[PDB]
């Protein structure tokens, strides 16, 4: 039996790609143990009962975990000590073992893995879980051709499209932090000599020159996205329609059933995620927009969140308006019913956008999102950004125009016909013999190599 470890970034917001692409090793014969800490390992069920489910080896004791007096300097040198030596410790006890591990898979976030790695004799690889075009913009600003404000009014960078200082991550929202996240940021090309591979959550057919522009910074390039699972794409590893690796518990859910009697492509989903806190200002633009459409709409929003909503709104669209604490966003996604998605475009949500086929009204918060929405609307065509005046408020009126232009507009049928063969692509690109699966086969048999 081949044994490799996955070690995501240890967060439930950064843990689901490396489990989705864990179950796709899985399913061609790799034995996958999965390095966390004690604080994943409490909050997620993440143990299979099968003999080939992925084994949760929990490495740390929770004194890594962030005190309240830190800058996010000393929370990250903390995780960073403390965490070398766990996985140093673990390896001590592995590298001896009766089966050890040949390779070591690691999240691009925690790039001192790699020097780990290099100090055992170990195989290892970074796994980029954000866009292509992120790793080209990280890069550029490593190398100083590009900087933190851009020193200019447009930027073109080599096989990229051009892009406007609005369209660069905002890193910014958290001023204290900002340095230390651009570090940490840039930190993740530094040392890629030594990666055996560079893994990337995209697909060829999404950001292909990207990929190439990659490539010839010397190491082999593998897209292995998008990691949706199976059951939403390709169909090809039985019952994979969560993101998890324990037996799925469905919730009691409302939206499915209010969906199926709406007509096929007429209905509004809405979701700004689960980490954006929306100010009222803004929330009440984005909720009479929406109203002033008179579409249907499924709007999922958290209950800190839906405090902050206009008193008699929920009231006031008691016919048209679904608004919800939870539903499934890829049950809701892959809804007949559902037309179009009003999204805060993080990377999770534009590749799930893509692989179900529904076209977007983008609405970018912050850090990478808006990146991704320059794509979606620019490079792949499948929607449209909100217009945004006054410092970042996009008012009802630029709300409901451009639902109105990506649902009713000239481009509509477009964004539809665009959506579709994107979701073409993205089945392709996971099912036997497409780009993503070629790179997994290929990863599979030069583990069996050694």
């Given at each position: 039996d081949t044994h490799i470890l996955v070690f995501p970034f240890p967060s439930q917001g950064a843990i689901n790609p490396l489990l989705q692409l864990s179950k796709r090793l899985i399913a061609k014969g790799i034995k996958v143990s999965l390095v966390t800490t004690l604080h994943v390992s409490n909050h997620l069920?993440?143990?299979?009962?099968?003999?080939?489910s992925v084994k949760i080896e929990?490495?740390?004791?929770?004194?890594?975990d962030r005190l309240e007096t830190d800058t996010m300097r000393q929370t990250l040198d903390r995780f960073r000590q403390k965490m070398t030596k766990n996985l140093e410790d673990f390896l001590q006890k592995a590298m001896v073992?009766?089966?050890?591990?040949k390779f070591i898979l690691y999240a691009?976030?925690?790039?001192?893995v790699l020097e780990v790695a290099k100090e055992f004799g170990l195989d290892r690889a970074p796994f980029?879980?954000?866009?292509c075009a992120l790793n080209s913009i990280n890069y550029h600003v490593l190398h100083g051709q590009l900087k933190l404000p851009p020193e200019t009014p447009t930027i073109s960078l080599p096989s990229m499209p051009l892009l406007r200082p609005s369209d660069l991550p905002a890193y910014d929202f958290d001023p204290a932090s900002t340095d230390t996240i651009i570090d940490l940021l840039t930190s993740?090309?530094?040392?890629?000599?030594?990666?055996?591979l560079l893994f990337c959550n995209t697909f060829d057919k999404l950001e292909g020159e990207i990929i190439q522009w990659m490539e010839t910074l010397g190491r082999p390039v593998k897209t292995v996205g998008?990691?949706?699972?199976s059951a939403y794409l390709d169909?090809?590893?039985?019952?994979?329609?969560?993101?998890?690796?324990?037996l799925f518990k469905p919730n009691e859910d409302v939206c499915l059933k209010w969906l199926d009697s709406k007509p096929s492509g007429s209905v509004l989903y809405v979701s700004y995620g689960s980490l954006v806190e929306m100010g009222e200002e803004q929330l009440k633009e984005l909720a009479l927009g929406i109203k002033e459409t008179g579409k249907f709409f499924l709007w999922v929003v958290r209950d800190t969140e839906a405090?902050?909503?206009?008193?008699?709104f929920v009231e006031s669209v008691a016919e048209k308006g679904l608004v919800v604490s939870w539903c499934s966003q890829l049950e809701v996604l892959a809804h007949?019913?559902?037309?179009?998605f009003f999204t805060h475009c993080g990377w999770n949500s534009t590749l799930e956008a893509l692989c179900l086929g529904v076209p977007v009204v983008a609405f970018p918060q912050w850090a990478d999102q808006v990146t991704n929405a320059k794509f979606l609307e620019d490079?792949?065509?499948v929607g449209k950004r909100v217009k945004r005046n006054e410092q970042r408020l996009a008012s009802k009126e630029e709300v409901r125009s451009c639902i109105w232009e990506v649902?009713?507009?000239?481009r509509a049928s477009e964004f539809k016909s665009n959506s579709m063969e994107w979701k073409k692509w993205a089945k392709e690109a996971v099912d036997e013999g497409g780009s993503s699966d070629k790179n997994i086969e290929e990863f599979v048999a030069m583990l069996k190599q050694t």
């Amino acid at each position: 039996d081949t044994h490799i470890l996955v070690f995501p970034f240890p967060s439930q917001g950064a843990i689901n790609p490396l489990l989705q692409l864990s179950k796709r090793l899985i399913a061609k014969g790799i034995k996958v143990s999965l390095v966390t800490t004690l604080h994943v390992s409490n909050h997620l069920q993440l143990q299979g009962a099968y003999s080939n489910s992925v084994k949760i080896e929990v490495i740390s004791d929770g004194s890594e975990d962030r005190l309240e007096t830190d800058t996010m300097r000393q929370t990250l040198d903390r995780f960073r000590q403390k965490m070398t030596k766990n996985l140093e410790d673990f390896l001590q006890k592995a590298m001896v073992s009766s089966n050890p591990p040949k390779f070591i898979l690691y999240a691009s976030t925690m790039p001192w893995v790699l020097e780990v790695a290099k100090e055992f004799g170990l195989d290892r690889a970074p796994f980029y879980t954000q866009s292509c075009a992120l790793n080209s913009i990280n890069y550029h600003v490593l190398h100083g051709q590009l900087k933190l404000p851009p020193e200019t009014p447009t930027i073109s960078l080599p096989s990229m499209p051009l892009l406007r200082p609005s369209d660069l991550p905002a890193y910014d929202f958290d001023p204290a932090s900002t340095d230390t996240i651009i570090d940490l940021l840039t930190s993740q090309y530094s040392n890629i000599q030594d990666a055996n591979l560079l893994f990337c959550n995209t697909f060829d057919k999404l950001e292909g020159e990207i990929i190439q522009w990659m490539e010839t910074l010397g190491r082999p390039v593998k897209t292995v996205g998008p990691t949706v699972p199976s059951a939403y794409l390709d169909k090809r590893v039985e019952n994979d329609k969560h993101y998890g690796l324990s037996l799925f518990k469905p919730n009691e859910d409302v939206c499915l059933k209010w969906l199926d009697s709406k007509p096929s492509g007429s209905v509004l989903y809405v979701s700004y995620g689960s980490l954006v806190e929306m100010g009222e200002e803004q929330l009440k633009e984005l909720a009479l927009g929406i109203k002033e459409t008179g579409k249907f709409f499924l709007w999922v929003v958290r209950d800190t969140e839906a405090e902050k909503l206009p008193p008699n709104f929920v009231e006031s669209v008691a016919e048209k308006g679904l608004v919800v604490s939870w539903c499934s966003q890829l049950e809701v996604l892959a809804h007949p019913s559902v037309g179009c998605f009003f999204t805060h475009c993080g990377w999770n949500s534009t590749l799930e956008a893509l692989c179900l086929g529904v076209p977007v009204v983008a609405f970018p918060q912050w850090a990478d999102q808006v990146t991704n929405a320059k794509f979606l609307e620019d490079v792949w065509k499948v929607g449209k950004r909100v217009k945004r005046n006054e410092q970042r408020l996009a008012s009802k009126e630029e709300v409901r125009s451009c639902i109105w232009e990506v649902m009713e507009g000239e481009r509509a049928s477009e964004f539809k016909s665009n959506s579709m063969e994107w979701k073409k692509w993205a089945k392709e690109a996971v099912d036997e013999g497409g780009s993503s699966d070629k790179n997994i086969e290929e990863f599979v048999a030069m583990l069996k190599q050694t």
